Design a protein around this ligand. Structure first.
Ligand code: HEM
Length: 154
């Protein structure tokens, strides 16, 4: 699959807004993921014990991982499809060390769309959401392929 320049522009335009507050969006997204799919929290040994949203909001560790996650995703998106080099180390750690199934990447993709929809309505209309979904699907398809090559695929 390939995105058009117009689609990449819609993706990068809303991402430019996200970058005004990376830490804030990172928290919203991970917390959304953890509330909608509690099982995903188990993968984070550092804060698997957090019991409430209040505790999650106060966690500096959770915030730091949110920033690291979004910054890595942002670098991938800015490559507009030419992300082979960026995906290699990411696919290896998540497949071999963290053991993150593709299903969880779908869950976080859902959390990303939900948060952008809530915080950037004016820059996240139907066309913009469609483009973002397409970019995340491309990301998931390529990462899944690397998982297979790495002997994980799952
Ligand atoms: C948008 C997709 C994601 C991106 C871009 C991303 C990016 C990253 C980055 C850059 C790191 C640090 C370097 C590394 O270990 O590779 C990391 C660590 C990690 N990621 Fe992800 N990640 C994503 C999704 C997920 C999901 C869905 C989970 C689990 C539900 C997850 C679990 C972890 C864990 C457990 C670590 C290690 C944290 C630690 O112990 O310090 N990641 N991720």
């Amino acid at each position: 699959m390939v995105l058009s320049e117009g689609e990449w522009q819609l993706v990068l335009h809303v991402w430019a807004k996200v970058e005004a507050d990376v830490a804030g969006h990172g928290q919203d997204i991970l917390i959304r993921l953890f509330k909608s799919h509690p099982e995903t929290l188990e993968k984070f040994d550092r804060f698997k014990h957090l019991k409430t949203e209040a505790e999650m909001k106060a966690s500096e560790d959770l915030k730091k991982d949110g920033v690291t996650s979004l910054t890595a995703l942002g670098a991938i998106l800015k490559k507009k499809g030419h992300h082979e080099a960026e995906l290699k180390p990411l696919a290896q750690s998540h497949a071999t060390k963290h053991k993150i199934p593709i299903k969880y990447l779908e869950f976080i993709s859902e959390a990303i769309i939900h948060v952008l929809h809530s915080r950037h309505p004016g820059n996240f209309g139907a066309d913009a959401q469609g483009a973002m979904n397409k970019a995340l699907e491309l990301f998931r398809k390529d990462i899944a392929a690397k998982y297979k090559e790495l002997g994980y695929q799952g």
